[PDB]
Design a protein around this ligand. Structure first.
Ligand SMILES: CCCCCCCCCCCCCCCCCC(=O)OC[C@H](COP(=O)([O-])OCC(O)COP(=O)([O-])OC[C@@H](COC(=O)CCCCCCCCCCCCCCCCC)OC(=O)CCCCCCCCCCCCCCCCC)OC(=O)CCCCCCCCCCCCCCCCC
Ligand code: BCL
Ligand code: BCL
Ligand code: BCL
Ligand SMILES: CC[C@H]1c2cc3[nH]c4c(c3C)C(=O)[C@H](C(=O)OC)c4c3nc(cc4[nH]c(cc(n2)[C@@H]1C)c(C(C)=O)c4C)[C@@H](C)[C@@H]3CCC(=O)OC/C=C(\C)CCC[C@H](C)CCC[C@H](C)CCCC(C)C
Ligand SMILES: CC[C@H]1c2cc3[nH]c4c(c3C)C(=O)[C@H](C(=O)OC)c4c3nc(cc4[nH]c(cc(n2)[C@@H]1C)c(C(C)=O)c4C)[C@@H](C)[C@@H]3CCC(=O)OC/C=C(\C)CCC[C@H](C)CCC[C@H](C)CCCC(C)C
Ligand SMILES: COC1=C(OC)C(=O)C(C/C=C(\C)CC/C=C(\C)CC/C=C(\C)CC/C=C(\C)CC/C=C(\C)CC/C=C(\C)CC/C=C(\C)CC/C=C(\C)CC/C=C(\C)CCC=C(C)C)=C(C)C1=O
Ligand SMILES: COC(C)(C)C/C=C/C(C)=C/C=C/C(C)=C/C=C/C(C)=C/C=C\C=C(C)\C=C\C=C(/C)CC/C=C(\C)CCC=C(C)C
Ligand SMILES: CCCCCCCCCCCC[N+](C)(C)[O-]
Ligand SMILES: CCCCCCCCCCCC[N+](C)(C)[O-]
Ligand SMILES: CCCCCCCCCCCC[N+](C)(C)[O-]
Ligand SMILES: CCCCCCCCCCCC[N+](C)(C)[O-]
Ligand SMILES: CCCCCCCCCCCC[N+](C)(C)[O-]
Ligand SMILES: [Fe+3]
Lengths: 300, 281, 239
């Protein structure tokens, strides 16, 4: 037995969770218990804290989602056969270059893209405020919110910051499955191949390292789960043979090692540096560097 | 030199080959038979790559590049200068990685832990062996493999990509990318949660695993749990690399046309193929 | 140009990050020692960080790391060579002595508490109303050892209340006393639990707990240590 799935589930009363300073008025009640989920992790769905930023995000994010789909249905001539057939092929495209950074564009040739983007802007930032506020309620550090900001960075660059600096909304990414892929491939071609963007290449090393490190870490905690390894917080406050055997596996393999707390600083950083370096690479593309081949040839 | 707690663990045993013979450390590093194997394969491989840099006539790591044998050589041996060095270095690389894995198994046995880490590593070795062995052999030349060089292996990626149009349209590539992005999202959150609990607002007590579950339920209505997130990280990342290997073993072999065109299987299905309007009618 | 400035800036940042990250991971185990326990001369280029202090919940005090580093227990090992870097042979029974893969840490002799300050791990008999909700219920199954001999029967599951999972099987031995085995070192089957790590004769040797309704961090470590050490040390008895 290797501890990828549980051999036995137990259930007790619904866990309505810790209280600290949270407003209990805004938490739901428990949802079902999924026995399926329970083989891998926890069986309990809910509760969920809603509140004001909860509903703003949730309404706002559905308005973005519906806006795109209503335009996909329109493109499909309102035919459910064509809709399902061409699903990956439809695209809400930003305004033409003609309209620059203007909100003048008609609904069928930009305006609809802008409406959907506004909604998405409210949805994401309100959700960011939510990850901070939930943590504050429980008296926890703001790690989750600051780590999330790194993801927001690259998104803000692609759809907002870079389209502004370049003086056109047409530079932004379209809402569509195959269209957003073509954009990505188009961007690289037009900027002389992103492989020569040194930020793109760091972005990849970190994406990579995220895969290699969570592979290492997950594997390591499962390997020492026979000494209560998963109980990271109590192993922090009172190091056990699990923390010791874990540190020593890696010391003896590759010559150095982590703490039970310290591995999590490695973890949060490896990950945020993906979108951090990624966003810088993109912001500098067409604003400062026209061609990463050409730039690379000068080195500067 | 030893960590304050280390000595009680430096006991004899857990070796797979040669009993007590290589059962010792050099500084922090455990050796074992597969320590000696790894050094032999690694040293031999570096010697060959330096001797390859001689024949190419450059000692710049931004130029050095050991290329497979050209397609016309098929699955045969080649002259060292014109493919044979790669062929031997590739055997030497495979020797180093497998030796490294089996060394991790010996370390596992001495420490009485599970074999999860070298089981996870085995997936990376299988990605590597796909690109330089399984795919090349199925295609019928070592020439189809990627070259060993820092920028020349990126050309190979780009040229192998654009042989099939925009390589984004490979459906197994799509799945693999989704796992890479999700794994990174999960690593960010996992590190952030544990640190937010161990390092709360100034002056307050360490939070508890209960705070960790509460925080998440509050946020998204579900909490996978401390054992589940470690199961998840391991699964997301081994999945990314699995589908990576899958996405390339089918490219050149069962599919050699433009990847975008593959999506016509869906569009041309009988019951909506001919229905006017939309993007594809 | 702006791009060359950015990438240079970033490489210096990353150098400082890696420094910060490496000194954070030196809060336990350091400074390095020689095999005699005296402090090694060469510590490498990274210095020990300023100590930090965790305020532990439920009035259990604080921890400052780095701080004074001792085992607070005797280590029954002897050198096998006259120079650094060779294995240290057990002087007695490594299982009983808690060395090698049988190693335990002298963690606090208190139970881990949950968010509310209640014991994290109870027997399921004292946990209302916890039940087996899925999978084979192991309670009443015979426990077999790697010598393919019966050592006892399961008489309860000890559950993690806040994490809602099974952590140990309580086993009744031939003499009427019980031991905890970790979930992670047993295979629940249709008609038995199989324990590969220990042969039947080594079940009595499993460390016992002071209270029958709670287990302490020290006790978890001695039991888990002991059972894991079986893989190496009960190998003559494995079939
Ligand atoms: C784009 C936006 C991207 C933002 C990404 C931020 C990642 C957040 C990671 C983190 O640890 O945040 C928690 C951290 C503290 O959390 P908390 O809940 O307030 O404190 C709880 C505990 O009391 C304290 O909790 P703690 O002890 O875990 O947190 C301490 C933390 C404090 O962390 C920080 O102060 C963050 C450091 C700055 C991040 C900005 C990176 C910018 C990169 C520049 C690249 C240049 C390109 C040209 O210390 C560090 O991580 C030290 C970083 C060392 C960097 C090395 C610098 C080398 C200089 C060269 C010589 O967040 C912040 O400090 C705010 C960051 C806001 C950034 C805007
Ligand atoms: C995976 C699909 C492609 C591929 C596509 C890309 C793309 C796209 C990029 C890279 C990039 C890199 N690739 Mg690659 N790369 C491939 C296969 C490999 C193999 C191999 C299987 O043997 C190796 C060793 C590398 C190594 C590298 C690094 C030079 C670099 C950053 C990797 C990283 O951070 O990983 C995560 C691992 C860690 C963080 C651990 C540290 C690993 C260290 C840094 C590796 C050193 C390798 C060394 C220079 C090789 C010689 C050593 C010998 C012993 C002599 N690639 C295959 C063929 N690779 C990036 C780059 O910028 O390079 C120009 C980049 O953008
Ligand atoms: C032909 C294509 C080009 C290329 C063109 C581009 C372009 C253009 C870009 C990249 C970018 C990246 N490329 Mg590239 N890239 C190429 C080849 C590669 C290869 C390879 C050959 O192996 C690799 C491994 C990569 C890898 C990468 C990543 C490192 C990087 C994206 C990081 C990320 O995680 O973003 C994913 C994460 C985000 C986008 C953050 C989003 C966060 C927001 C806030 C979430 C919104 C959710 C929303 C509300 C919906 C709700 C959903 C439901 C609730 C579920 N590229 C080639 C050379 N690449 C990006 C980059 O970072 O630049 C360097 C980028 O812009
Ligand atoms: C223009 C190029 C094409 C493209 C063409 C290709 C081609 C060709 C390939 C990929 C492959 C991949 N592409 Mg693509 N790809 C494109 C755009 C993207 C984008 C993007 C955002 O646009 C992303 C995110 C990706 C992502 C991916 C991944 C799914 C995958 C690479 C990971 C992998 O296989 O690791 C696997 C990991 C390894 C092979 C590493 C193994 C490490 C070994 C075992 C150990 C090395 C040890 C070392 C030598 C020791 C160093 C010394 C020490 C430091 C001491 N591609 C564009 C459109 N892509 C690759 C793939 O799927 O490979 C199977 C692949 O071949
Ligand atoms: C370190 C960078 C990585 C990262 C991290 C990251 N993402 C994050 C966070 C963090 C730390 C959060 O805290 C936040 C979250 O809530 O996670 C559970 C989030 C988040 N990242 C998400 C998605 C996401 N992250 C991505 C990428 C990444 N995020 C990087 C790989 C991507 C990609 C690959 O493009 C996606 C699609 C969400 C689950 C969430 C932001 C939620 C949000 O803004 O929702 C608004 C909209 C709605 C509520 C309605 C949706 C419409 C209907 C479909 C329903
Ligand atoms: C499967 C999930 C992810 C993963 C997992 C993983 N990797 C691992 C492990 C695990 C679990 C280890 O235990 C092991 C380790 O020790 O990690 C620190 C390792 C490891 N993964 C590493 C790297 C690595 N992993 C990668 C990928 C991944 N690893 C996945 C994303 C990549 C990528 C994405 O490119 C790299 C570069 C090493 C740090 C280490 C393996 C070290 C090893 O095998 O050492 C023995 C060999 C040598 C010392 C070198 C010998 C040199 C050769 C003889 C000649 C050169 C051969 C090579 C083909 C040259 C090519 C260079 C050019 C392409 C630039
Ligand atoms: C909680 O438990 C855990 C620990 O300890 C308690 C750990 O240490 C680790 C190990 C992880 C770290 C120390 C974090 C930093 C690691 C990385 C970023 C991974 C990349 C590693 C390298 C670049 C080093 C590679 C070097 C090698 C293989 C040695 C070659 C040199 C010779 C002389 C031979 C993990 C995963 C863990 O989960
Ligand atoms: C079946 O029918 C129903 C009813 C369910 C509807 C169906 C819906 C469907 C099928 C929807 C499908 C949607 C898809 C496929 C969307 C895909 C989107 C993708 C892939 C997005 C990719 C990238 C997006 C980016 C980078 C967006 C960035 C946005 C910003 C940074 C915000 C920019 C804001 C702007 C321009 C306006 C700012 C204005 C002010 C005043 C501040
Ligand atoms: C990723 C979330 C969903 C995971 C669901 C997977 C269910 C696995 C079922 C395991 C079967 C139980 N068994 C036989 C191993 O005890
Ligand atoms: C990530 C998906 C998980 C979502 C789980 C959310 C559960 C919601 C609980 C519904 C119960 C509502 N009510 C009013 C009866 O308490
Ligand atoms: C958390 C720190 C981990 C550091 C990992 C860095 C890997 C080195 C990548 C080198 C790539 C540089 N390049 C070619 C893009 O300029
Ligand atoms: C370019 C990325 C590769 C970096 C590899 C660094 C390996 C560090 C090894 C630590 C061993 C230190 N030592 C010998 C003093 O114990
Ligand atoms: C890819 C980045 C990972 C490598 C970072 C370098 C860490 C080396 C630290 C050596 C530690 C040696 N010592 C004596 C303190 O144990
Ligand atoms: Fe962890």
């Amino acid at each position: 037995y290797q501890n990828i799935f549980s051999q036995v589930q137990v259930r007790g009363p619904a866990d309505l969770g810790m209280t600290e300073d949270v407003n209990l008025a805004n938490r739901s009640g428990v949802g079902p218990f999924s026995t399926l989920l329970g083989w891998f992790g926890n069986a309990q769905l809910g509760p969920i804290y809603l509140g004001s930023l909860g509903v703003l995000s949730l309404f706002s994010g559905l308005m973005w989602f519906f806006t795109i789909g209503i335009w996909f249905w329109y493109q499909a001539g309102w035919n459910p056969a064509v809709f399902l057939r061409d699903l990956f092929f439809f695209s809400l495209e930003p305004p033409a270059p003609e309209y620059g950074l203007s909100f003048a564009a008609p609904l069928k040739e930009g305006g609809l893209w802008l409406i959907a983007s506004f909604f998405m802007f409210v949805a994401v930032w309100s959700w960011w405020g939510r990850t901070y506020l939930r943590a504050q309620a429980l008296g926890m550090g703001k790690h989750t919110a600051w780590a999330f900001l790194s993801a927001i960075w690259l998104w803000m660059v692609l759809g907002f910051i870079r389209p502004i600096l370049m003086g056109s909304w047409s530079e932004a990414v379209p809402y569509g499955i195959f269209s957003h892929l073509d954009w990505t491939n188009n961007f690289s071609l037009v900027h002389g191949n992103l492989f020569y963007n040194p930020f793109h290449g760091l972005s990849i090393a970190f994406l990579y390292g995220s895969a290699l490190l969570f592979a290492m870490h997950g594997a390591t905690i499962l390997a020492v789960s026979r000494f209560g390894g998963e109980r990271e917080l109590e192993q922090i406050a009172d190091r056990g043979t699990a923390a010791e055997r874990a540190a020593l596996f890696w010391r003896w393999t590759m010559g150095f090692n982590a703490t039970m707390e310290g591995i999590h600083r490695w973890a949060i950083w490896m990950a945020v540096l993906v979108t951090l370096t990624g966003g810088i690479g993109i912001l500098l593309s067409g604003t400062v560097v026209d061609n990463w081949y050409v730039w690379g040839q000068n080195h500067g | 030199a030893l960590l304050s707690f280390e000595r009680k663990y430096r006991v004899p045993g857990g070796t797979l080959v040669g009993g007590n013979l290589f059962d010792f450390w050099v500084g922090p590093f455990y050796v074992g038979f597969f320590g000696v194997a790894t050094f032999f394969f690694a040293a031999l491989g570096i010697i060959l790559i330096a001797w390859s840099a001689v024949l190419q006539g450059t000692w710049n790591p931004q130029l050095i590049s050991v290329y497979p044998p050209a397609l016309e050589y098929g699955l045969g041996g080649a002259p060292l200068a014109k493919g044979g060095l790669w062929q031997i270095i590739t055997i030497c690389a495979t020797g180093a990685f497998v030796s490294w894995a089996l060394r991790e198994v010996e370390i596992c046995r001495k420490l009485g832990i599970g074999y999860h880490i070298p089981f996870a590593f085995a997936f990376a070795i299988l990605a590597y062996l796909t690109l330089v062995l399984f795919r090349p052999v199925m295609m019928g030349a070592w020439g189809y493999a990627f070259p060993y060089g820092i920028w020349t292996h990126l050309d190979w990626v780009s040229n192998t990509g654009y042989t099939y149009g925009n390589f984004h349209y490979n459906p197994a590539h799509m799945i693999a990318i989704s796992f890479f992005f999700t794994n990174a999202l999960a690593l960010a959150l996992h590190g952030a949660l544990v640190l937010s609990a161990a390092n709360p607002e100034k002056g307050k007590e360490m939070r508890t695993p209960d705070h960790e579950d509460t925080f998440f339920r509050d946020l998204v209505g579900y909490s996978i749990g401390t054992l589940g997130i470690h199961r998840l990280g391991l699964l997301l990342s081994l999945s990314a690399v699995f589908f990576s290997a899958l996405c390339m073993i089918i490219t050149g072999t069962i599919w050699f046309d433009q990847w975008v065109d593959w999506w016509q299987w869906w569009v041309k299905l009988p019951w909506w193929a001919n229905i006017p309007g939309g993007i594809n009618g | 140009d702006l791009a060359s400035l950015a990438i240079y800036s970033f490489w210096i940042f990353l150098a400082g990050l890696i420094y910060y990250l490496q000194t954070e991971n030196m809060r336990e185990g350091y400074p390095l020692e020689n095999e005699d326990g005296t402090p090694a001369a060469n510590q490498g280029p990274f210095p020990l960080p300023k100590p930090k202090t965790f305020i532990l919940p439920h009035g259990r005090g604080t921890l400052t790391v780095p701080g004074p580093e001792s085992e607070d227990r005797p280590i029954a090992l002897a050198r096998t060579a006259v120079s650094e870097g060779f294995p240290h042979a057990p002087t007695g029974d490594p299982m009983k002595d808690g060395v090698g893969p049988a190693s335990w840490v002298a963690r606090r002799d208190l139970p881990e508490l949950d968010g509310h300050g209640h014991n994290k791990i109870k027997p399921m008999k004292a946990a209302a109303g916890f039940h087996v909700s899925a999978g084979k219920n192991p309670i009443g199954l015979p426990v077999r050892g790697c010598d393919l001999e019966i050592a006892g029967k399961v008489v309860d599951i000890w559950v993690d209340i806040p994490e809602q999972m099974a952590r140990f099987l309580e086993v009744e031995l031939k003499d009427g006393s019980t031991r905890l085995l970790p979930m992670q070192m047993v295979k629940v089957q249709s008609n038995r639990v199989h324990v590969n790590a220990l042969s039947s004769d080594l079940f009595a040797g499993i460390p016992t707990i002071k209270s029958p309704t709670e287990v302490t961090l020290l006790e978890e470590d001695k039991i888990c240590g002991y059972v894991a050490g079986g893989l190496m040390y009960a190998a003559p008895k494995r079939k």
